[PDB]
Design a protein around this ligand. Structure first.
Ligand SMILES: NC(=[NH2+])NCCC[C@H](N)C(=O)O
Ligand SMILES: [Fe+2]
Length: 336
């Protein structure tokens, strides 16, 4: 029994999916281009039927924290060495696998990026960056990436976060936790449903973690506003018996002087820490983390810096792009 839903491709199914992604990589210039963004959800209809059935059904189940698809081949020789930075990470060896993640994502929803994160890319990279071991962003290593809702600060945050493991030779775990409903008392639960908490943007939206450009110039103003003047929001929303979750372990606080909110948040921290569990994304595994049901993070690890570090491709997915239309910055697909 597992708190996520799991699908394992047969070799033939895995090969057919890989072949489809390879065809897309031949026919489109880029994953993030207007053309593939629009076409991917229709091309995805050609994926193996058993996989399409799993994705359609598992998305509608009440319980899972993630949807995990195992068994995509990745040839390390063809893939090439892990890049030293996300900037240079669009390597030819990783291209077909970026197309594959996009195709799988297109079965779940609408993909998007942020003007203020990795130069507005839709398919982003997770890999350790030398000098950045003890930071609060996903290019950390030696410091654990604390649990979080992705883009917790933003009402336009993803419904699902998709991750494809290109390599993970030493088996570093992703961490997950749901709402600790078996332990939250009714008074604490009540307070977490109230608009008594502050959630600021995480460090991935800072200018210094993007390139020199205007690849998102004005959108950094909105990040500054969310950082300087956060509006009080609720941590829990929806059904009391199955709440949705909005929290960041390192970027959340109580509203100013609100000691009851503080107690509720401190209790939630304790209960999430106590229930956090591990999911190891082995090479070729894809996970879609439900960013409303669960928080996620990543265990501390010693980086290699020898060309074979852990490397994921990542994508933000929403069930409805039109929810974020106020933030439609560089078209509908790059928010801020
Ligand atoms: N410690 C944290 N809460 N970090 C948030 C990290 C999330 C961000 N999208 C990143 O990839 O870096
Ligand atoms: Fe994350």
């Amino acid at each position: 029994v597992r708190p996520w839903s799991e699908f394992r491709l047969t070799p033939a199914e895995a090969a057919a999916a890989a072949a489809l992604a390879a065809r897309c990589a031949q026919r489109y210039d880029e994953t993030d281009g207007p053309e593939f963004l629009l076409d991917a959800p229709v091309i995805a209809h050609e994926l193996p039927r058993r996989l399409r059935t799993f994705m359609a059904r598992a998305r509608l189940d009440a319980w899972p924290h993630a949807l995990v698809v195992r068994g995509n081949p990745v040839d390390d020789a063809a893939l090439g060495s892990t890049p030293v930075h996300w900037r240079t990470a669009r390597t030819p060896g990783s291209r077909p696998l970026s197309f594959l993640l996009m195709l799988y994502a297109g079965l779940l929803g609408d993909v998007f990026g942020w003007a203020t994160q990795q130069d507005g890319r839709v398919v982003t990279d997770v890999l350790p960056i030398k000098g950045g071991e003890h930071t609060l962003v996903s290019s950390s290593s030696r410091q654990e990436l604390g649990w979080h809702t992705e883009d917790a600060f933003s009402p336009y945050r993803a419904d699902y976060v998709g991750l494809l493991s290109l390599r993970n030779p030493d088996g570093v775990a992703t961490t997950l936790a749901g709402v600790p409903l078996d332990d939250l008392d009714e008074r604490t639960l009540d307070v977490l449903f109230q608009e008594r908490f502050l959630i600021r943007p995480d460090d991935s939206h800072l200018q210094v973690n993007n390139s020199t450009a205007q690849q998102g110039r004005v959108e950094f103003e909105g990040i500054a506003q969310a950082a300087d003047r956060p509006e009080p929001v609720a941590i829990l929303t929806g059904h009391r018996a199955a709440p949705h979750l909005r929290v960041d372990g390192d970027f959340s606080a109580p509203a100013e002087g609100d000691e009851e909110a503080a107690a509720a948040l401190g209790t939630l921290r304790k209960l999430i820490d106590a229930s956090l569990y591990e999911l190891v994304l082995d090479q070729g595994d894809v996970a879609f983390i439900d960013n409303r049901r669960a928080v996620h993070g990543r265990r501390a690890f010693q980086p290699r810096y020898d060309g074979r570090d852990r490397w994921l491709k990542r994508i933000n997915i929403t069930r409805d792009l039109h929810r974020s239309r106020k933030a439609w910055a560089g078209d509908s697909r790059v928010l801020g």
